Design a binder for this molecule. Structure first.
Ligand code: HEM
Ligand code: HEM
Ligand code: OU4
Ligand code: OU4
Ligand code: H4B
Ligand code: H4B
Ligand code: ZN
Lengths: 411, 411
């Protein structure tokens, strides 16, 4: 049974057979769509069918389905599960798994790059200091003096859920936020809650506007420990504007490496609860969301003031106008410092080409239109007119509750 | 099952019980979300019709606080007998108006639904001819325009009987500009209307072959061949488009019409099918500026606007498209507001819609909403609907898509 999607700007129609391989649920039903809902402990019982399914996929991809290496591996995993109640992925399987978790990430516009992922095996790690050293190396390799390279570091998988590895930071590099007694916020409001945990764990907060947060790392279920990334490893870009000389005086900067560290990697029923992964920014992530969201740095007002816009009535579109300039400045600053960045016209065009190629050679490409469409200038990007099917494929990256809500404290 | 939606910019959480009344289907399943598909989806048998009417009359008599009353049961009985005999039934004028207002109230893709109860309903069910149709539509246009002080209106023509006697307005909107292809390359006028502009000429229209030629009306009564009619130019209020800073803007020779009057949908009340039901409101600025002027398959004038702004059109990363998009939308609002023609900007409409959502959750328990369509086609994340989770589901009475008549009509 086939399903069709139509690009209404080019009348290109593609056919999706891949959605039949979907297993997990979406949250939607025949009578309700939850497409805009942000967010819609495992035993031997349900694990071998998950392993068998992953291994079938793995050996199909290497054109060895039904081979002796395939049947032998199935057997070996089988006995290892009934005997040890889990199993270990080979290096080849881990790398395939991590690449396909990205390939399957329906909300990721950057997936044209999925096959060029540098996979760092940190499964021998045992301590938070060992985590800090693995993460320092990831940051150095991925940053590459501005010539950014996609990377993932994979720490030991969950066993009984009482010995999890977790990175408590939502991203490896993020700026601190401090709520002031007068109700205002110093720094990134998005990080106030995490900043307070850090201070409570003994972090000495400089209390500046762009302080890089410490790493808060949890190994084998132990209490998390604080470490400071060497500042020389944190590449930062001062934001200036190519026409507006006063823009630099706003004193803004941003870090070069987007490295998301709070998601869970699922491969063949195995759960990798600490698996930081990094790429490079789309400009709007910083310029639209990080600076102009009302609940973020919210520099929209000051930029509009310095531009001398009609800020009286919103129908003057001063907000829209300031937003475009801030994003021009983000792109200009990164390009001038030769730090890898992509604008949202380039990134959406590439994704369409990626999506079409995936329909040709894979039978589909799961895609979350709500998330793929950029947060500004939506309809003048080619994804806006593109119909998309959203379904859940594994290997996958999943959400997980923040660890401070679930952690049993040692003391 | 008593679902919840969170606003992520305000943490406000609403609880949706209204969705449990949902009758029709969304097109999603547990395995696949189709929330970005443009269009999912002959007589009604004597059996299917009575439950549809009971459901509708039940909610009608609830709304007037007479559920389970004398008047209710009698009406239920009376309609039951009429269907039994005539194989259809007629709505009381009160039921007609309620049904029409609630079809708007239920239009999950409509951002302007805070105005839903202030709909002027014109009962044209006594109409028998295309000339009579034309008379009703001129009266609609003049009433709705109101010398620029636009007023919401729907005009409802006779309901479908056996699908052989359908009343249809062939235009997609009452007022739309013509589109003629060129012997050399692209298109003059409006490319969305190229096929229809042909079926007008190919039906007898004498095209002035300008860029802003108001299309003729093509009206089909009782299933007969449709007829061409010209709307009196003095009823078509138009706004010349200029910019409050750029005097070269007028040189572009741009104007748009004040009245958005959609005429190709089907209104369904209590099982009855009104195939001709043109309804009108007033524009949100982006529906002209972002879509009608800057979509690649539309007026696509982005090229010359950025050129006349002397912007760096060599790399996409200068965001010249974005800058031009903002300016074109500032001009549309400016021109409409200057000429005292009603228009709403995307910031005001979306703010209004959050307020409407809150009202609907309070006094009705929910509000079906389609985030893919409620979020404006520009500056999405700086409008409040972006961070608002929404639940999409289909309630009746409703407006529905219907096939284009020329694909159906035996000529
Ligand atoms: C290389 C350049 C990349 C770019 C430009 C990019 C861009 C994006 C953007 C713009 C989003 C939307 C999130 C938001 O706007 O808040 C996203 C989501 C996502 N990205 Fe990519 N990304 C890149 C690489 C990667 C890599 C290397 C991985 C993993 C190995 C990854 C995994 C994901 C996932 C899992 C999501 C969605 C998470 C969710 O479901 O909530 N991305 N990406
Ligand atoms: C009065 C001011 C109104 C405003 C500002 C407004 C705004 C909008 C916008 C922006 C859309 C998205 C469509 C697009 O982007 O092309 C839409 C859709 C829609 N509007 Fe409203 N609208 C208004 C009045 C009305 C009225 C009076 C009705 C019916 C009586 C109505 C029914 C609809 C329907 C049925 C749809 C979408 C149809 C579908 O499901 O695809 N609107 N509106
Ligand atoms: C490798 C990479 C590169 C990039 N250029 N971008 C990325 C963006 C995300 C990502 C995914 C989900 C997100 O949303 C989480 C959420 C917040 O609230 C409810 N869910 C966010 C928001 N930081 C970012 C993940 C990875 C990214
Ligand atoms: C009264 C009113 C006012 C307004 N201010 N705006 C409106 C916009 C629409 C509307 C409905 C559906 C649409 O899409 C249907 C479709 C046609 O082809 C493929 N899908 C479109 C886009 N033309 C507009 C309908 C009514 C509107
Ligand atoms: C492919 C996509 O579903 C299609 O372009 C939709 C997306 N959202 C939209 N949203 C609005 N308001 N109007 C539209 O025409 C569309 N088009
Ligand atoms: C409610 C809504 O789904 C939520 O705000 C989503 C919408 N789409 C998004 N799209 C991107 N790229 N990033 C986001 O954080 C979000 N947030
Ligand atoms: Zn859905």
């Amino acid at each position: 049974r086939f399903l069709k999607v139509k690009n209404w700007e080019t009348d290109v129609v593609l056919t999706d057979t891949l959605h039949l391989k979907s297993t997990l649920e979406t949250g939607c039903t025949e009578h309700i769509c939850m497409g805009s809902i942000m967010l819609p402990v495992r035993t031997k019982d349900q694990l071998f069918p998950l392993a068998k399914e992953f291994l079938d996929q793995y050996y199909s991809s290497i054109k060895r389905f039904g081979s002796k290496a395939h049947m032998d591996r199935l057997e070996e995993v089988n006995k290892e599960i009934e005997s040890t109640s889990t199993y270990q992925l080979k290096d080849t399987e881990l790398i395939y798994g991590a690449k396909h978790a990205w390939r399957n990430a329906s909300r990721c516009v950057g997936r044209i790059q999925w096959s060029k992922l540098q996979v760092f095996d940190a499964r021998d790690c045992t301590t938070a200091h060992g985590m800090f050293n693995y993460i320092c190396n990831h940051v150095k390799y991925a940053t590459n003096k501005g010539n950014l390279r996609s990377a993932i570091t994979i720490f030991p998988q969950r066993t009984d859920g009482k010995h999890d590895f977790r990175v408590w930071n939502s991203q490896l590099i993020r700026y601190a936020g401090y709520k002031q007694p007068d109700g205002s916020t110093l720094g990134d409001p998005a990080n106030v809650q995490f900043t307070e945990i850090c201070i409570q764990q003994g972090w000495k907060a400089p209390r500046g506007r762009f302080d890089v947060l410490p790493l808060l790392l949890q190994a084998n279920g132990n209490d998390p420990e604080l470490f400071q990334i060497p500042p020389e490893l944190v590449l930062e870009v001062p934001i200036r504007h190519p026409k507006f000389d006063w823009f630099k005086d706003l004193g803004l900067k941003w870090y070069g490496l987007p490295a998301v560290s709070n998601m869970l990697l699922e491969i063949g029923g195995l759960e990798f609860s600490a698996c930081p992964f990094s790429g490079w920014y789309m400009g709007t992530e910083i310029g639209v969301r990080d600076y102009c969201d009302n609940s973020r740095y919210n520099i929209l007002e000051e930029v509009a003031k310095k531009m001398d816009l009609d800020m009286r009535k919103t129908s003057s579109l001063w907000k829209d106008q300031a937003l475009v300039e801030i994003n021009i400045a983000v792109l200009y600053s990164f390009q001038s410092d030769k730090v890898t960045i992509v604008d949202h016209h380039s990134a959406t065009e590439s994704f369409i080409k990626h999506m079409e190629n995936e329909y040709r050679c894979r039978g589909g490409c799961p895609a979350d239109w709500v998330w793929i469409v950029p947060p500004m200038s939506g309809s003048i990007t080619p994804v806006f007119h593109q119909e998309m099917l959203n379904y859940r494929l594994t290997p996958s990256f999943e959400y997980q509750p923040d660890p401070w809500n679930t952690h049993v404290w040692k003391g």
